[PDB]
Amino acid sequence: TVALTVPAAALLPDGALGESIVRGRRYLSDTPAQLPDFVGNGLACRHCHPGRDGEVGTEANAAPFVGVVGRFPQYSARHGRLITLEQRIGDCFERSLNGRALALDHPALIDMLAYMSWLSQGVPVGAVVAGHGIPTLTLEREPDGVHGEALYQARCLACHGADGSGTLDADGRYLFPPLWGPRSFNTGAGMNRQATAAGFIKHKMPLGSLSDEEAWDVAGFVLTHPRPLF
Numbered sequence: 001t002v003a004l005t006v007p008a009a010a011l012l013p014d015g016a017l018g019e020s021i022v023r024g025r026r027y028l029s030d031t032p033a034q035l036p037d038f039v040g041n042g043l044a045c046r047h048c049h050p051g052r053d054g055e056v057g058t059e060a061n062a063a064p065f066v067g068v069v070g071r072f073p074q075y076s077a078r079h080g081r082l083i084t085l086e087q088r089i090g091d092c093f094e095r096s097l098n099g100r101a102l103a104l105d106h107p108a109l110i111d112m113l114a115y116m117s118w119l120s121q122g123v124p125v126g127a128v129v130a131g132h133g134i135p136t137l138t139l140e141r142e143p144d145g146v147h148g149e150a151l152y153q154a155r156c157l158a159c160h161g162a163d164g165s166g167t168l169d170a171d172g173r174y175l176f177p178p179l180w181g182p183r184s185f186n187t188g189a190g191m192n193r194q195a196t197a198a199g200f201i202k203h204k205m206p207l208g209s210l211s212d213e214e215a216w217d218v219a220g221f222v223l224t225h226p227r228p229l230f
């Protein structure tokens with residue numbers, strides 16, 4: 001693998017590419033408000049792909065976009081063939097954002113690509129960046145949703161809500177995003193899979209850690225709830 005490095009925002013180039021990169025960051029950070037025609041829930045890309053200092057997709061084990069461009073095209077079992085990064089992003093809009101894929105030459109999509117390419121500067125094509133993806137956590141037993149409910153109340157509810165519906169900020173964006181219900185990800189999302197949710201939670205939640213057993217059980221509890229159908 002190669003190291004995860006985040007480029008300097010002050011070294012962004014003047015011109016069309018620099019302006020596209022800045023728009024891309026905003027589409028990834030503020031997706032429901034910037035692309036209402038394509039987003040069907042309350043999630044922005046940054047809610048599962050967090051980053052520091054206003055960037056999106058720069059955190060190890062939270063599916064960083066640093067280096068993603070050099071890993072496409074790649075096989076998708078979902079599609080039964082090779083897909084491009086443009087297509088992968090469309091799947092995210094359809095599933096994680098319960099919405100509609102952008103056209104493959106949509107300027108907003110190209111801006112998102114430009115941003116991911118910027119984050120990927122210096123990464124050799126084909127190389128795997130340390131911390132890529134969301135590593136799964138799988139235990140050798142069923143998740144205990146009763147334990148998970150107790151853990152949720154003690155460790156998660158203060159942010160994500162008794163009803164899992166999250167906490168809105170003053171501008172109507174989610175400060176703490178919804179984990180289930182009509183504004184959360186739909187059943188087709190990767191985050192709807194037990195080992196993925198458990199892995200994400202293990203590595204990233206609560207914000208600011210859980211034992212494997214705790215992450216496994218609270219993920220199980222989260223995933224007992226209704227959410228939009230894909």
Ligand code: HEC
Pocket residue numbers: 043046047048049050151152155156157158159160175176177178179184185191197200201204205206207208218219222
């Ligand atoms: C208690 C262990 C939990 C569980 C099970 C989850 N969280 Fe959080 N969460 C918070 C914020 C700001 C985000 C956005 C991403 C980020 O900036 O890091 C998240 C994201 C999630 C997700 C993914 C998004 C989704 O809507 O599904 C999941 C599955 C998730 N969390 C589960 C903020 C907080 C907190 C405020 C300080 C606390 C506490 C937690 N989260 C605790 C948990």
Ligand code: HEC
Pocket residue numbers: 028031043044045046047048049063064068071088089092093096097112132133134135185189190191196
């Ligand atoms: C949680 C509900 C998510 C939201 C909202 C978005 N994404 Fe996502 N994404 C998520 C998971 C669990 C994964 C799998 C990570 C892995 O281990 O492979 C992804 C993956 C991507 C990828 C591929 C990353 C790779 O390394 O191959 C891309 C390019 C991606 N996601 C883009 C993306 C965009 C643009 C989003 C807003 C429209 C978005 N994702 C939201 C979970 C979630």
Ligand SMILES: O=S([O-])[O-]
Pocket residue numbers: 091092093095096097188189190191
């Ligand atoms: O493509 S993901 O949202 O399952």
